[model samples]
Target: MYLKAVIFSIADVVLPLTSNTQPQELKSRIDSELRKLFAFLSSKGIKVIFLTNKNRNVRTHDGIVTLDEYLKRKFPESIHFCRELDNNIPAKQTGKAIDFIMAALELKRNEMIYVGRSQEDLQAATNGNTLFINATWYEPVTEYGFQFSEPKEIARFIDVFCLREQLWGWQGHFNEDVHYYALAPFSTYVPLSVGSPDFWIRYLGASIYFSGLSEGASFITTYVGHNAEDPYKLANIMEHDLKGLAVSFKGKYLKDLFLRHTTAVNITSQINTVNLNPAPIKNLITGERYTNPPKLKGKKILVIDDFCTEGNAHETARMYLKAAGANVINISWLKTINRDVSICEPTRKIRPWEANTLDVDDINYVGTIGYAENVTHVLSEKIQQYDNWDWPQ
Candidate 1:
């Protein structure tokens, strides 16, 4: 919703000219595609303008049809050439054409994006606060700004980057927005075999779009303390899964925020298992594991876990992140069957070797545990929808 205007380069973006001439066939095809694209952009009330060499004489198959006359005759009033903006100023002088355009339109730099194929255009955009998108429809080039293959991809990026705001789906949620959510429950996996990490990668990659996080964020996985053999190694695999998932989205990677310092055993195998207590491993998630990034003081984080049960580990990790001054979004691949989520509140920063200060008394059980079968259907044909990474949701 923030975009108001789009600045384009005429040389290669809008109408590429080979030796200042384009084949009629190419022009006709571009007209067919560009018409719909421009129409859609117009529908969004996005003003489109072209910037080019201001006073150069251009040649075409039609003899002496110079660029200025050709462009003004073919398109609505928009043709600017580079020049020294200052005619009679002090020793200081520079061209401020784009600067003038921004002011004339009353547009903030952030509200506009420059789409061009030249380094000069990118420099113009970077010289200010405007965003830049590299156009590669006509020809490919080595560049940095967000590159788009065609006009349609540009629209898709705008819709996602500028307009869409949402959060990922879960079978159900407890405690409104934070307790826990999962794509499916634990039991159904017994009947299915396609539980590949890549599946979660694509699914979560697409799901991150719904997170509505305007600013970029980081991805971390919770400490999964299960009875599986070599659970520590298994935990590393979970972290690797999230690494691949982070690829389809824009975010930084913050490693080892929450770690497993204690033995890797199922909750039932521990003495506190009698009461579903999460105290035994409270300090499993702490800043002492590694150097906490200073930027995290007021940042957003996405915490992904394999299974959501009593939420001891999930909420425990949240407590660590909260203590470190961060807003956390907790998610799980599968919520344990017949179990309700419990929230934890741990405060002190503990070293990896330190013991946890919190116990079962600190846990907040939001609801009573229910039957596994009841929530099993919550996953019916749900994950199938994410088989392909759909965008611009």
Candidate 2:
């Protein structure tokens, strides 16, 4: 499993607000499915830890039922607690709780998710750089975060959507000024070669949506240098599946120009990104400043690619897009393992067909140690596990 643990906001989320007097009616409000969900998570080796903003000084709730007793009665597994939350740090430092908990469990940011329902819960997850899934089982419209109305929905996202998703995306360096994501680890790069554009269109489209760039976006793929084989048709996929959430950059506004020409192979050439030129995007799609291309001064784009080794190609696209005053979010099918990306800054504004220059640079790759153990293999197991497995693609 890619996730090592799941941090739950205990107070108002998992545990509801109850009065000093309560009974079976209140107990019924708790969907017993969550109990099964917790046990299922435990069986999958995913730790379920409860987190709260409460400090040692705060008095315990004086309810008809207490915390531990209620948890024990409601769930089957032994739930763990983070060390006295806000023990040494202030809760105002919202990320500290997650930091200590991560340190204690020896987990990475991407390895865990914070499940909660309140605005504070959303803030904590945002500040902590941890993924959050809003538990709206108690409240429907959060107006924030990814909403999950039921525990079963969350279970499906993890079990089927996330686990079986071979072509997935993860952030390397994320911030307002800079952002990017990788779909798979380079170790599993071979598996990504299985399908054609039809496969990738549906695949990258879903993975890109999961990466948080579902709407109001422009799209581009890593243009092959020296005019090599067009390995991916992601530009069209983004135009198609993405139209489901299309709120901007519509009509002929999309530009699928293969503008990049300089080929700097960072891995083989041992060349770092810093030394590269803002290489001018020479030869304007037929010698023009793109006759009537969309002006992207304030647009948001999701850059697509086949793989990310050192980010030379993606970051190059990034610099140009940034220079055009448009925002960028890079999501590739696979990323090289053991290497994180360095921020590549945009030096100057660039338009397609204009001159430019620039330079470059996993998962969670352990689950896919053997190249054959991939999405295809997992699908085969699931289909056959039951007696009759015959679904031709």
Candidate 3:
């Protein structure tokens, strides 16, 4: 609970200060978790600093006087320091700036902690000899020992150092059984409808988000979906947005095939029973079930889907692509549902789980809160075409 200083990498951790994001709208879109963090740390008398690799040239805009100005206005009297590295020193040299801050604070390495989003931040922490924590909320990856999913958890994490030792890496990608990436930390429900702008916005945001994280591609993406035309529509949007080619077993004809074979009943039953067997791969344009390798020679493929209950669809798609001489990457909007203690689990009954009495470790919650009461109501319910609940790690 007693820490001298907390340093944060301001770019993605605070407001995703990307060039694409307009300076005028940034004040309204400040991350909700960061807002709570500034308040919590200030009350604790912790010295909070904002460290960035972005140059002053990139940060200044019409409405924005400076990145520091924007952050100061948002949390006045909260943030003690906000500094950018010298414009000339780039990449790993940013670590030198971190070292300078440490000298200025005159604090021991163990007394301070740094939270960041990339490998560069990790290197900075190592060079500065300070404890490193990954901000997994924005970028979900597990290359380090400690990660914070919600910014508010930082204070509590330091408070319970002994508990922190017990919990190692909480980032979701450590599971070796699956072939997909950890796009969303929790599974979400996205209803699919033809011309549904809501679905497009939600999924497109996800696609663009993941695209920023994905590296090296040969431009072929696939959607492992049911006969539902909605999956095809989503695949089209992703392909158009990513500007990649769409690779599939059945193109437009697959819609009729899915309607004829799979239904909501089968989708629900498959998820409930935990059966993810791969079905036969068929050709949509030719109406030919693939007897031999399809025409995916030397191509890189990305598989997209709505739900991934057991990862069978992605696994099967991966197998087909590999057999056909293509590199495969798998992703989905809704991942497998898990009953893990990583996130807050909803109450099964009311009496034993009294409202505010639930402690920080209750089920898998880090702290008790206001909105979870509503989440508890839908804990046991399954109201969807498919549930892609990944197993809890």
lDDT per residue (tens digit) for residues 1-393 in model 2: 466787787644675543334454543555466776786687678888776554222223454554545555555465545344335544623766778777778877666777776667767765676656667666555222234566765665566444544435355444465565655455544552343332344344335444445444554434444322442254433434233222111212232444433333342121121121233222323423443544667877666666666565666666666666777777676666655564444433344335544232210111111222221223234223322311112
User: Sort by TM-score, best first: what order?
Assistant: 2, 1, 3
How well is each residue in 215-270 modelled by candidate 1, as lDDT tens digits?
35554444535443343443455545444334223343344444344443222122
Each candidate structure's TM-score, on Cα atoms with residue i matched to residue i, is 0.48, 0.48, 0.36
- Give per-residue lDDT, candidate 3, residue 342: 24
Candidate 1 ranges with C-alpha deviation above 4 Å: 10-12, 15-32, 51-59, 63-71, 77-103, 107-111, 117-131, 139-146, 156-344, 350-393
Off by over 4 Å in 3: 17-30, 55-62, 78-94, 142-145, 162-393
- Model 2 vs. true fold: TM: 0.48
How close to the true structure is residue 316 of candidate 1, measured as C-alpha lDDT? 62
lDDT of all the models against the reference?
0.50, 0.51, 0.43
Kindly list the per-residue Cα lDDT of model 3 for residues 115-159, writing each as its tens digit. 776667666765554545666555555322234566745644443
